[PDB]
Design a binder for these strands. Sequence first.
RNA 1: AAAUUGAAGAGUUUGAUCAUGGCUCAGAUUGAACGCUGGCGGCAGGCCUAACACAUGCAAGUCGAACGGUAACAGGAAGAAGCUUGCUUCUUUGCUGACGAGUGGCGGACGGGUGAGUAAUGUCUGGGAAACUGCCUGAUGGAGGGGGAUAACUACUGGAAACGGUAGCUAAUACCGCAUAACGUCGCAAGACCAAAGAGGGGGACCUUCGGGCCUCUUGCCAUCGGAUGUGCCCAGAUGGGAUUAGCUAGUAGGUGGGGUAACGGCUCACCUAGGCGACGAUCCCUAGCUGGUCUGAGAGGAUGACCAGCCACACUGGAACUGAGACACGGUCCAGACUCCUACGGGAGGCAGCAGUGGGGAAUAUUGCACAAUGGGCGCAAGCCUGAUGCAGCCAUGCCGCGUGUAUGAAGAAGGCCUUCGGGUUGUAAAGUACUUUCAGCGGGGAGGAAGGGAGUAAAGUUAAUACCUUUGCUCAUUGACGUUACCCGCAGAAGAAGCACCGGCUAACUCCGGCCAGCAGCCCGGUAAUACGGAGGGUGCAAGCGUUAAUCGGAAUUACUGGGCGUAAAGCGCACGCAGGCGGUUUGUUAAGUCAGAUGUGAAAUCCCCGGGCUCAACCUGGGAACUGCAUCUGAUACUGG
Lengths: 82, 205, 80, 86
Amino acid sequence: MVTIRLARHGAKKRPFYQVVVADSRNARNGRFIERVGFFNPIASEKEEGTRLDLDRIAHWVGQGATISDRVAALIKEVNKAA
Amino acid sequence: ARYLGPKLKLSRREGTDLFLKSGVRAIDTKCKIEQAPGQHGARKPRLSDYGVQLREKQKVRRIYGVLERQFRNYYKEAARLKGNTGENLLALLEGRLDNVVYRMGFGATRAEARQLVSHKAIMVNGRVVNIASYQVSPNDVVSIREKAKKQSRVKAALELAEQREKPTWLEVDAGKMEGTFKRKPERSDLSADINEHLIVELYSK
Amino acid sequence: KIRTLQGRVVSDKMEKSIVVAIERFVKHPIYGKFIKRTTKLHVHDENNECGIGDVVEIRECRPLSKTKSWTLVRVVEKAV
Amino acid sequence: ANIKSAKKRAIQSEKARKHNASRRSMMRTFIKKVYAAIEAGDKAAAQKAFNEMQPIVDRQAAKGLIHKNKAARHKANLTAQINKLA
RNA sequence: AAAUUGAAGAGUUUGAUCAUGGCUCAGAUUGAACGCUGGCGGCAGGCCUAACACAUGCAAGUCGAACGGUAACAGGAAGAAGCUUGCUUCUUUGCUGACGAGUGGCGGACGGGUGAGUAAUGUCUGGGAAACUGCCUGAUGGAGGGGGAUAACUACUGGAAACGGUAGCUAAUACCGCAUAACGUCGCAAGACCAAAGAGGGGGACCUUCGGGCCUCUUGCCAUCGGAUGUGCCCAGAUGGGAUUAGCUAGUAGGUGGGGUAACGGCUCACCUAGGCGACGAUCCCUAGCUGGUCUGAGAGGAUGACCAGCCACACUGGAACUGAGACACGGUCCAGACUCCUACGGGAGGCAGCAGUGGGGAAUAUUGCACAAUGGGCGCAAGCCUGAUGCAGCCAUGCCGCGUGUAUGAAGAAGGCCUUCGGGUUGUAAAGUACUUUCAGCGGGGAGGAAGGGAGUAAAGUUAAUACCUUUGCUCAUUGACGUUACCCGCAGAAGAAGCACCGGCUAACUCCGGCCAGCAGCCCGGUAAUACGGAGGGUGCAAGCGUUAAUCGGAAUUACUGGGCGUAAAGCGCACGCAGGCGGUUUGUUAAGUCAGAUGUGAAAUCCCCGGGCUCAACCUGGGAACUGCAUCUGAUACUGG
């Protein structure tokens, strides 16, 4: 199915995830349909590390796209903070 | 990655004082400055165009103590930046951390200033920065750490700097052993005996 | 309103089909000269309405044989 | 095979192959009956064979042996061939 | 606001000159190799050759909430106790927590590897119609009632093994009818026809044949129409060289009809017509994965396609199908071949171009490592299990980047070395001496972040007949890290553990002494007895944990000249002419809007390049946003020029 998940970009020991909408059969960092945000897990709290568009995410979830557990937690925290 | 050999040899080869010694004497009393190094130093051969360009580049490098890879990257970034390439290059050279520490007065020479920086005795905005090539930005505050304020090296350097000229872009307090980088120096603030266009022509050929 | 082409009929010996040559004016990618280029298409001509030399208007459709994927729309000029 | 799942898959695949072969041969026979009735020109026998062939063809198309498109093709072809006689 | 601000020459033909013209050099770059040398770290990269052959270990499993079950270990158990009476130690029970084997479901078509084949059966760009699509998702309905088997198991038995055979028994969400049947299929229509499956949680009473039926919730099942995704198919243009390859083609081109496919189609067959491709290079031959991109360049171009991402092809060689939504299937099946191995000689088994690794080839490319902690994947209600993907670690200076190998003072300028007009000069503040410091490495002590979740509790809401069960939402408690002795910080001691390589005739920065066209050097133009060119020494120059040589691409090379060259004598006007294809074409009007131009829309994947910022102590690196992607198609206009 179509899933919304993270693609682990970045450097060694300093990950940077791109929230991508991708067909669940492709590789992690492989072919994806649309990038709907990012997530920097080692942000300094001085800057922003969660800029995932909720509009297109909700549009895709409305079309049957699946949300991974980490992306679900990210959406929950983004809704709580904002 | 460092030049550790004789210092006055460089100033004798360049025919100009490179401030490679503290200043307890005049260089004329320590070496034959007007004579090139080596057995054939009395002769002065006619320099080519490439000779003059290379000698000016080497003079700037030996002034700032920068090796060739870092200086080439400096020229690359200066040619990338907008404006005149030469003053961009000299500003990038003056922005270094050890250069500022020397100009601030905490180092008698840029070698001992680089030793102060590298040995984790210099702070930038309260954060100990031990990179000599660290680009110091405007409004930055550079200070000696609490543990290194007890060294007589810094005292002698402070005195030797008080007997020098004062740079316009540095607000230093010798008591607190701290200073502020107000701004990048314009072309008119550095030495006038440095032809940046020679380096630009050498690196653009 | 439908996307179509236009060319001259160079062969009609086959039954229910014609060969239309679409000539186009393309600039040379290197030397900048505008050169002629010919695109010959096997077009389906039901009723055998088109003769050699007709300037015909054709459109693309589903494959009708091994080499025919275009069909005729109308004839503009008729072999004279 | 080296993996256990591969061995079980081979066993299941040959069992399903035999089952599908039986079903496909039955369907092919019941369609050949309609085709032979078409050849003979017997329209009553042709419609009888078509009425016998239609349900099992729909059933095998519904059970996943053949596609619904193939069942529709068979039905339409044999209907158009029967209508060419009477 | 920014995101094209970009272009260097030199040596060598001559006694000398100008021109022509080739050769060579100065610049970047690399999946590099070799020689000398070698301190640390961060980030990346690492069989380019034999798509040669492979020892060994792992790389795809999962579900008891589908099913009969119980073989193993943990418990409950009824009954018999060694007896040191509160340890109770073995006889039987799937009773349950679970679970080997087995049926069944899903997954093994993903993820991972290689570039052999492929010059268009592929790729890129832009369009299109005649299609299917498991899991995910929206809507509407249904989900009734039966049957025959079969694995396991049991008994016997054939084999060295691999693996079977016979007879009997049993279950299901396995299999098969029946009923049902429409906005589904066939048909113009009438009508005809087609499906299914249960399981789990809890429970108030009513009724129980003591299993439970009965209620509710969750989940699963079947049919149809959609969405999303993926895939199949078609057209145009582009995508190497060779004419010392010019003709090619019989299912060949088209048509009618039958068949076939999920789908159009010579996809296939019968018949008929006689066509189709080709000088805009068909056919044939050699080479080759394609692209975003990378290197170079001022640009146009030239070269190239390793890592990263998309597409394709392959899986020992050749062929084929089966299952399945999807394969003609790396770790599936059948056959044939070569090869290797086991054998009781009758038969068997295997495919590292998965991760390590071995032999071989080569100038050359690494560990038979740790963990599923994070991301993702498969299965499962979930817990969870599996995952050589992946996260990390090991090795290599292979590259980029950063830091260190100390700092200050230090003379009549010591010694030795080298040169010397023998005065001295230089090595050279260089050393020694003195004062100071401790980055990195060494020893010891603290110590983030990658960690989200998941579990158990309670409380609220929803659901319900129910204050159970379940779902969501708060809070509480105890936990989850391979890296790892982390990054980072703090303390100790002592300059203590850390500089080499090439060059010095000109091009090209850097000069003297000593030893015979020999030894030797040489990228292009020295050595025949005072050689700045050989070899050594002193000195100096350039780079620096690197330095050189070799190999390769572009530049310089305007030296294939589109931008941007020439042909009287330097290479170059066919011996001359006629002339088909082709190229170009006097002048006016009208018309068209093909070239051309303008605007808009769609697209031009992400990464990369560039600009402004942000985070790593800086940098490399990572990253936010923008610009760019100079292209193609469509639509609407313009009519000067070219074309009709």
